Amino acid sequence: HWGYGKHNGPEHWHKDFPIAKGERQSPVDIDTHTAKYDPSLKPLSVSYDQATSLRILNNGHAFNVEFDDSQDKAVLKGGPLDGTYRLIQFHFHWGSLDGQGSEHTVDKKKYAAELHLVHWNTKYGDFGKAVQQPDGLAVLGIFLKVGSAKPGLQKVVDVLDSIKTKGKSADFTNFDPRGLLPESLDYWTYPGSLTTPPLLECVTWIVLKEPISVSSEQVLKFRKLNFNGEGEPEELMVDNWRPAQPLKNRQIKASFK
Numbered sequence: 506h507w508g509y510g511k512h513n514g515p516e517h518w519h520k521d522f523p524i525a526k527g528e529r530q531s532p533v534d535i536d537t538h539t540a541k542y543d544p545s546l547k548p549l550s551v552s553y554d555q556a557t558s559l560r561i562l563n564n565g566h567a568f569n570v571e572f573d574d575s576q577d578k579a580v581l582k583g584g585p586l587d588g589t590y591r592l593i594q595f596h597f598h599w600g601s602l603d604g605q606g607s608e609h610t611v612d613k614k615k616y617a618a619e620l621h622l623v624h625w626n627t628k629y630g631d632f633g634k635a636v637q638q639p640d641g642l643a644v645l646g647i648f649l650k651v652g653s654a655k656p657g658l659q660k661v662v663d664v665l666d667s668i669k670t671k672g673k674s675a676d677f678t679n680f681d682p683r684g685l686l687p688e689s690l691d692y693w694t695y696p697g698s699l700t701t702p703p704l705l706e707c708v709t710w711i712v713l714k715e716p717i718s719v720s721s722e723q724v725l726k727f728r729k730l731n732f733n734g735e736g737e738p739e740e741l742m743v744d745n746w747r748p749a750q751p752l753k754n755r756q757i758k759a760s761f762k
């Protein structure tokens with residue numbers, strides 16, 4: 506029964522998910538002046554040309570665009586990662602207004618939204634086994650600011666009317682996630698967690714420095730989705746973000762000088 510409201514939101518999650526107060530929780534504030542350049546990091550290898558999207562689902566928290574991960578197709582390698590991580594889904598977090606919505610912050614700045622491309626380490630065979638491991642997942646995070654439209658996002662925007670309420674899904678084949686990336690792959694990285702329950706501490710976070718621009722109209726359509734199911738009182742799907750958590754004994758590394 507967790508969610509993002511006053512009575513089931515981030516301040517309550519620890520009661521059913523005590524790892525919420527753990528040692529490597531996400532998101533975090535990225536303090537740009539103390540994140541040290543690491544020359545031992547590698548360029549990120551994002552190989553999405555063979556991605557096979559399947560479906561888009563309103564899960565009552567966000568919407569997920571799901572991929573066929575049954576074989577090595579869309580994969581993330583390099584950067585801080587050892588081995589190969591397979592894309593399973595992407596989703597966003599966003600605000601009720603443009604001045605909030607991101608989960609990570611940069612020198613305390615909140616972006617209007619944040620895209621998470623979720624990948625699992627193929628050495629563990631399946632996503633469920635990967636989330637029992639401290640290096641099971643890699644999430645590529647991309648900030649959204651409001652300005653010019655993002656052409657590669659429009660196909661997502663235009664299907665949202667058909668998945669307004671929790672539990673609705675729609676076919677979403679032949680979507681190219683390369684259209685959601687910025688120009689630069691410069692990034693920050695740190696060890697963290699899922700940002701929603703069960704809050705598992707499995708994630709190598711890779712957060713791109715360059716935001717993507719989306720238009721006001723694109724993000725406004727995100728905000729017309731519903732947390733509730735069909736026939737229930739309308740609760741707009743907005744402010745589905747967790748605030749920054751304590752950094753504790755962690756270092757954020759920069760891939761760029």
Ligand SMILES: NS(=O)(=O)c1ccc(NCc2ccco2)cc1
Binds near residue numbers: 623636644698702703
């Ligand atoms: N916001 S996020 O990128 O950290 C993220 C990514 C993936 C899941 N998955 C949730 C799940 C299902 C079974 C175990 O866990 C939850 C949150």
Ligand code: NA
Binds near residue numbers: 539757
């Ligand atoms: Na540091």
Ligand code: NA
Binds near residue numbers: 575576
């Ligand atoms: Na297959």
Ligand SMILES: [Zn+2]
Binds near residue numbers: 596597598621700
């Ligand atoms: Zn997320």
